[PDB]
Design a binder for this molecule. Structure first.
Ligand code: HEA
Ligand code: HEA
Ligand SMILES: CCCCCCCCCCCCCCCC(=O)OC[C@H](COP(=O)(O)OCCN)OC(=O)CCCCCCCCCCCCCCC
Ligand SMILES: [Cu+2]
Lengths: 47, 269, 534, 113, 102, 59, 121, 45
């Protein structure tokens, strides 16, 4: 637990890696936030 | 050496706890219980064995955590005066929340003293509503419960004083009395007072009595865990973190039972 | 990530999870409330073709998410477990397992509500669960049960958080601090914990009773047997009235802290501050039945309840005067937390005085369960929850994570959200004062324009929130580039106007809280030697 | 004898606080023992006989006139007490269960369905 | 609120007496200006003496600016005029006539 | 007793998780949750898949 | 491996190496060497005159000037101490961040502080 | 020696612009709903 310098270790993100340039993560967070109202509207009625 | 380790582990009564899976697994157990109950009572599948097993595994996880909370107090130790005071205060606030639960149960029907309302009741005593009243029926057990609590509170005082053969006798007496109490509770399983069809006045009393039948089970579970521990003799007459909990519980439950017996029995009759 | 985060046992490492869940839940709830306002713009089925049950369910979801799952998890826990152990100076709070089990019991409530909305049953009886409308007589299906377990788990998590707060602050408080020198935010959270402890069990008992009535084929509050829902309304309001204070008081604490640290002058009678807070906390219980004057109680009962309300109002005025004294006769640096604090002191005060005006016993004949009450509480919730959380974030983010934020972006975000909130909530008093009812997707044809201005304001507010999350991203990705350049303020307390700048190098940040004096966030088990005050 | 470079966390010296804490511990133990002893004595003196008298008279009154509930199960629906709107109202529809539209098969509370 | 000027005055001069560097000078001057007590010419002269002891002319400029604008005091000027001229021409710290026309 | 001290000494010597008391119990309980709860929560959304889609559009 | 007396606080190596032997039947063991956990470190100390987590404030009366700055005992690299005037409570609460190499001052109080750790290799 | 003020002169010359500005701010903050009322077809204009 004492092996973390304390710069970016406080957030479950990672600058290193070409998998997500902090864009796919924010896109997914937007998507999951907008999911519940959109799906709630869609399951019984139109958007 | 000694000074540095003393300062680095003195004000730190918290172990470097491993990646304990307890939170996620207990949360998963509660969520599974909730959704399974919702699906079973009114849903698509009415299977009962699987949800029973879900409740069983939730109780196993709870028992595992509850035995750890006292095993790590003695097997691992690493405790100071401050953490003992904190644990005792936590047990006190827990029993205070239980007392608040009991007070809410009492106030569910105790606010109708002089009949301030007009209809749908507002008549103390409820003349005309005379089914098999759950009042004065278990008082034969309440009096023996008072006697048992009185005779075991000082026995547990002598326990915490000496933790000796006298303590063993007190524990055996407590086991006998709790066994008698669970037996007389289960004897009134189905037909205790009546069922709920019309005129809900004693039905609330029956529900209030029924929903509290788990605290005695918890007390018996803790007593059995301590019995097993002292059979293993891990716990001496030292860091008795469970003996203090059981003595405070038996010193508060008698008080709350006395408060329960003050009214609701001879009031209005 | 699972080895340390999903299996976490550290208060600092879990406060950030608290924050992440708070921000995600807020973004989702703001989107769904955006929808709710969007079908309210014009009469008819502009976007919701029939199915008013969906509209009711969305309203319930909005209310429950903001109340129990958004901000109470945010300021109570997230700020509490990141400041209180940190301000005390103890290395770790007692039993972090308590914090972990409190946190991890949240998300399944979210999934059970989302599936309860998903199923055709739905929970469309308001966020209040008054019987018999939530029983099998009216609403079947699992929606009611899922909501009940959600509130049960949230209550359990809140109780665990309060337990940890109490044990840490009372059992192993640092030696230097004593009863007569304890800071203000911790006093606020302590009183909050007391009220939470005295409020949770009655809700748990009553809602368990409703669940048992729905299941055990009985009825204690339903008339089906002789019960009366007046008792349940008594119990529910007895829980509810403490809850608003629970969510509002830590806002008082943080606002007092920021105005003290930014005015360069001490507080005005911190003993008076804690006196006001304790009086509010203890006096909150005298109005258990003040929210239902419409029932038809006796005149003496109404008189006593309104006397209790007007007594309750006084300590809030004392606190407001105390803040005015703190701000008076002092230098002010017009930074964004000051903007939030001033918006609070204005709009929260105006809303609270309106509520005090309504607090008349016979005045509920005009406002109760109308749009006036929603204009009432939207004000104070927005000021003491949204703006309080914003102030705390912009007041601690540059240090708790080491990452600054664009000051211009923060200013424009504040202006946008303030004007949006004002233009949204102001007309609803005009809506209510006419006497239009509440909880209806379709309304008569009188106040279309006010709903329209409310809707455009809602769009303004959501644009402000999008800008806020963009600010979050920019802070998380461009912090080191922002610190070096002139894009942000790096010293909140400017030097006194006598003191040279070279000497100011060794006087960087000195205030009345230790966490500002720390370096960049160290290892979780910091504070090898506990802090001592001479 | 673990090493210590300068000081083994000596802290405050062995002052008079040691015997004060000892006196506090023995005072607490003596108070507990004395209160237990006096409570036992006053219980066996007066409290236990009074509790026994209450128990025996409660048993007597329960067996005297409180046993009339045994025959309440079989009662004609023609001499009901002068009750009021507390009962005889619509109830929850029965979907789960088998025994007399209730969980517990105790058809004794009322004769109206 | 019925507080004597003499005690805190004497504290200011006595703290100025053992001014080792400019830190105590700065803190004492800030505390003096913190009260509503408009500084007396004597305490300002002692402060300038301490500043000359520590050899930092900017302290003198800053304190002169503070005297010019510390409190409204119903916009009194000639008091400011004398309180500045006596301490300017007592020994000589020529600083006001340069920042103003710049 | 005669096993407390030896047990503590061995545990201190072998600083390992699982606390050594119930390894078989842990290995028994670990797969059960995944087998049972996952397979009982999957129907909750799998069955209403055909039920879902009730538009109820009116005009 | 076996029971350890630990009668003295200067002979204990390993916080868990001491469990504290008790008694099964007979009389209660004395509260000297039968406690599991580090609790004996404080209970035996206060039994013989050693306290834990002293709450004594520093020398508030002394201003701690250049000649005789006050001395704080903390073996850590950094420290969290401060001043509240010569009496208990005089000014607004304030405290400093002393370091191993340089010093820190109390600003309005003028109380110059110093960090004094025990010698380490 | 009572130099200058005469509180009234400076007090008025400071407050009156401030009071006028504050009243104008309130006038705008209450005229924007009035602006909406005018611009909207309240009277079919
Ligand atoms: C936090 C509390 C909170 C917030 C933010 C809101 C936000 C909004 N609310 Fe709501 N509302 C309630 C609490 C809240 N509400 C409660 C408790 C009820 C009771 C239900 C009842 O009466 O039955 C209610 C009910 C309610 C109704 C009653 C509907 C009906 O009668 O059925 C309406 C009607 O339009 C409404 C509208 C809005 C609108 C347009 C916003 C918009 O302002 C949305 C935009 C949000 C804000 C401008 C605040 C920002 C919020 C954030 C989450 C920002 C995210 C960032 C951070 C948190 C860091 N709300
Ligand atoms: C943030 C949450 C919050 C806060 C802070 C408050 C603050 C207050 N509330 Fe409100 N309230 C709610 C949330 C909140 N409320 C909610 C959610 C409802 C229910 C709506 C629903 O059911 O849908 C509600 C409803 C509600 C009602 C019933 C109306 C209803 O039907 O909804 C009443 C009336 O008694 C009331 C009163 C008050 C008072 C007196 C304060 C005060 O504490 C205000 C504090 C501010 C001050 C009072 C300022 C200080 C005043 C002075 C400067 C002194 C001046 C006067 C004197 C001389 C003393 N509230
Ligand atoms: C943007 C700034 C923040 C929002 C302020 C405006 C919100 C109120 C509102 O948008 O009011 C809308 C009302 C309309 O009312 P209406 O019923 O005719 O709208 C139904 C028909 N759209 O006036 C206006 O269109 C004013 C338009 C601008 C007039 C000034 C310029 C004239 C040239
Ligand atoms: Cu209220």
């Amino acid at each position: 637990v004492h092996f973390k310098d304390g710069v970016y270790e406080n957030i479950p993100f990672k600058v290193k890696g070409r998998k997500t340039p902090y864009a796919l993560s924010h896109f997914g967070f937007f998507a999951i936030g907008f999911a519940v109202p959109f799906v709630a509207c869609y399951v019984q009625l139109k958007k | 050496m000694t000074h540095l380790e003393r300062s680095r582990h003195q004000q730190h009564p918290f172990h470097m706890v491993m990646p304990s899976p307890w939170p996620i697994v207990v949360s998963f157990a509660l969520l599974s219980l909730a959704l399974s109950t919702a699906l079973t009572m009114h849903g698509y599948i009415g299977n009962m064995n699987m949800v029973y097993l879900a409740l069983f595994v939730l109780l196993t996880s709870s028992i595992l955590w509850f035995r750890d909370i006292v095993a790590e107090a003695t097997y691992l130790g690493d405790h100071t005066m401050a953490v003992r005071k904190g644990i005792n205060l936590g047990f006190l606030m827990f029993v205070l929340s239980e007392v608040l639960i009991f007070a809410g149960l009492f106030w569910a029907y105790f606010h109708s003293a002089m009949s301030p309302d007009v209809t749908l009741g507002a008549c103390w005593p409820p003349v005309g509503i005379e089914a098999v009243q759950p009042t004065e029926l278990p008082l034969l057990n309440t009096i023996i419960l008072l006697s048992s609590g009185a005779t075991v509170t000082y026995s547990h005082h002598a326990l915490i004083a000496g933790n000796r053969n006298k303590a063993l006798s007190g524990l055996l007496i407590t086991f006998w009395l709790i066994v008698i109490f669970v037996t007389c509770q289960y004897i009134e399983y189905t037909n205790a007072a009546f069922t709920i069809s019309d005129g809900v006045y004693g039905s609330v009393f029956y529900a209030g009595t029924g929903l509290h039948f788990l605290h005695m089970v918890m007390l018996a579970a803790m007593l059995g865990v301590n019995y097993w521990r002292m059979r293993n003799y891990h716990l001496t007459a030292g860091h008795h973190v469970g003996y203090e909990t059981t003595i405070i519980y038996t010193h508060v439950l008698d008080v709350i039972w006395l408060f329960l017996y003050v009214v609701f029995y001879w009031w209005g009759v | 990530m699972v080895q340390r985060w999903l299996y976490s046992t550290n208060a600092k490492d879990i406060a950030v999870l608290y924050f992440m869940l708070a921000i995600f839940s807020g973004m989702a709830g703001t989107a769904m409330s955006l929808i709710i306002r969007l079908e309210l713009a014009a009469p008819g089925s502009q976007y919701l073709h029939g199915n008013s049950q969906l509209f009711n369910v969305l309203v319930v979801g909005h209310a429950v998410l903001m109340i129990f799952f958004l901000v109470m998890p945010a300021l109570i826990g997230g700020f509490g477990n990141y400041l209180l152990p940190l301000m005390i100076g103890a290395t770790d709070t007692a039993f972090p397992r308590i914090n972990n089990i409190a946190f991890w019991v949240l998300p399944m409530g979210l999934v059970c509500l989302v599936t309860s909305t998903l199923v055709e049953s739905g929970a469309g009886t308001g966020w209040t669960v008054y019987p018999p409308l939530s029983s099998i007589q009216a609403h079947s299906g699992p929606s009611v049960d899922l909501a009940i377990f959600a509130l049960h788990l949230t209550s359990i998590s809140s109780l665990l958080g309060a337990i940890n707060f109490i044990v840490t602050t009372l059992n192993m408080r640092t030696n230097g601090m004593t009863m007569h020198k304890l800071p203000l935010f911790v006093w606020s959270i302590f009183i909050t914990a007391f009220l939470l402890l005295l409020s949770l069990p009655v809700l748990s008992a009553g809602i368990t009773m409703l669940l048992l009535d729905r299941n055990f084929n009985t009825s204690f509050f339903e008339v089906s047997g002789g019960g009366d829902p007046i008792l349940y309304e008594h119990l529910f309001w007895f829980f509810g009235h403490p809850e608003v204070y629970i969510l509002i008081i830590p806002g008082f604490g943080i606002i007092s802290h920021v105005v003290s640290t930014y005015s360069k002058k001490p507080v005005f009678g911190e003993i008076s501050m804690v006196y006001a807070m304790a009086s509010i906390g203890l006096l909150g219980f005298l109005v258990w039945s003040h929210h239902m004057y419409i029932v038809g109680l006796d005149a003496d009962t109404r008189a006593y309840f309104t006397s209790a309300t007007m007594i309750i109002a006084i300590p809030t005025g004392i606190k407001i005067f105390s803040w005015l004294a703190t701000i008076h006769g002092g230098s002010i640096r017009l930074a964004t937390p000051m903007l939030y604090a001033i918006a609070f002191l204005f709009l929260f005060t105006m809303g609270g005085l309106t509520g005090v005006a309504l607090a008349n016993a016979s005045l509920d004949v005009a406002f109760h369960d109308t749009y006036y009450v929603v204009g009432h509480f939207h004000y104070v919730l927005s000021m003491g929850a949204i703006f309080s959380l914003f102030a705390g974030y912009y007041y601690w983010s540059p240090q708790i994570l080491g990452l600054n934020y664009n000051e211009k972006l923060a200013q424009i975000q504040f202006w946008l959200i303030f004007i949006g909130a004002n233009v949204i909530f102001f007309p609803m008093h005009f809506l209510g004062i006419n006497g239009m009812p509440r909880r209806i997707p379709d309304y008569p044809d009188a106040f279309a324009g006010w709903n329209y201005v409310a809707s455009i304001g809602s769009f303004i507010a959501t644009l402000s929130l999008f800008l806020f999350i963009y600010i979050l991203y920019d802070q998380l990705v461009n912090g080191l580039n922002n610190k070096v350049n002139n894009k942000s303020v790096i010293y909140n307390k400017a030097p006194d106007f006598v003191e040279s700048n070279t000497i100011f190098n060794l006087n960087t940040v000195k205030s009345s809280s230790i966490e500002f004096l720390l370096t960049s966030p160290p290892a979780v088990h910091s504070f090898n030697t506990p802090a001592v005050q001479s | 004898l673990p090493p210590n470079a300068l000081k083994p966390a000596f802290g405050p010296p062995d002052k008079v606080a040691a015997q004060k804490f000892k006196e506090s511990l023995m005072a607490t133990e003596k108070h507990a023992k004395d209160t237990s002893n006096m409570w036992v004595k006053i219980s066996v003196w007066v409290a236990l006989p009074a509790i026994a008298l209450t128990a025996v008279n409660t048993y007597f009154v329960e067996k005297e006139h409180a046993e009339h509930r045994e025959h309440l199960k079989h009662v004609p629906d023609s001499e009901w007490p002068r009750d009021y709107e507390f009962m005889n109202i619509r109830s929850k529809p029965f979907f789960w269960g088998d025994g007399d539209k209730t969980l517990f098969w105790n058809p004794v509370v009322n004769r109206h369905i | 609120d019925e507080e004597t000027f003499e005690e805190f005055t004497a504290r200011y001069e006595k703290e100025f007496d053992e001014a080792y560097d400019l830190f105590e000078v700065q803190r004492v001057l800030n505390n003096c200006f913190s009260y509503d007590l408009v500084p007396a010419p004597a305490v300002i002269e002692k402060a300038l003496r301490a500043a000359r002891r520590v050899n930092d002319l900017p302290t003198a400029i800053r304190v002169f600016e503070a005297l010019k604008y510390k409190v409204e005091n119903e916009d009194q000027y000639k008091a400011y005029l004398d309180e500045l001229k006596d301490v300017r021409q007592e020994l000589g710290v020529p600083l006001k006539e340069e920042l103003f026309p710049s | 007793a005669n096993k407390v001290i030896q047990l503590q000494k061995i545990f201190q010597s072998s600083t390992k998780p699982l606390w050594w008391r119930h390894p078989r119990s842990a290995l028994y309980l670990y797969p059960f949750y995944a087998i049972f709860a996952v397979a009982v929560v999957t129907p909750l959304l799998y069955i209403p898949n055909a039920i879902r889609g009730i538009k109820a559009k009116k005009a | 491996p076996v029971v350890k007396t630990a009668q003295n606080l200067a002979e204990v190596n390993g916080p868990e190496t001491l469990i504290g032997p008790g008694a099964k039947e007979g009389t209660v063991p004395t509260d000297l060497d039968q406690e599991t956990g580090l609790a004996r470190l404080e209970l035996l100390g206060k039994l013989e005159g050693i306290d834990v987590f002293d709450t004594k404030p520093l020398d508030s009366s002394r201003k701690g000037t250049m000649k005789d700055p006050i001395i704080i005992e903390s073996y850590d690299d950094y420290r969290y101490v401060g001043c509240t005037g010569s009496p208990a409570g005089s000014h607004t609460i304030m405290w400093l961040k002393p370091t191993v190499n340089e010093v820190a001052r109390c600003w309005e109080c003028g109380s110059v502080y110093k960090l004094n750790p025990v010698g380490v290799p | 020696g009572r130099i200058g003020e005469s509180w009234v002169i400076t007090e008025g010359r400071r407050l009156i612009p401030e009071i006028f500005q504050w009243s104008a701010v309130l006038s705008v903050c209450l005229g924007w709903p009035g602006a909406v009322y005018f611009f909207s077809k309240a009277r079919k204009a």
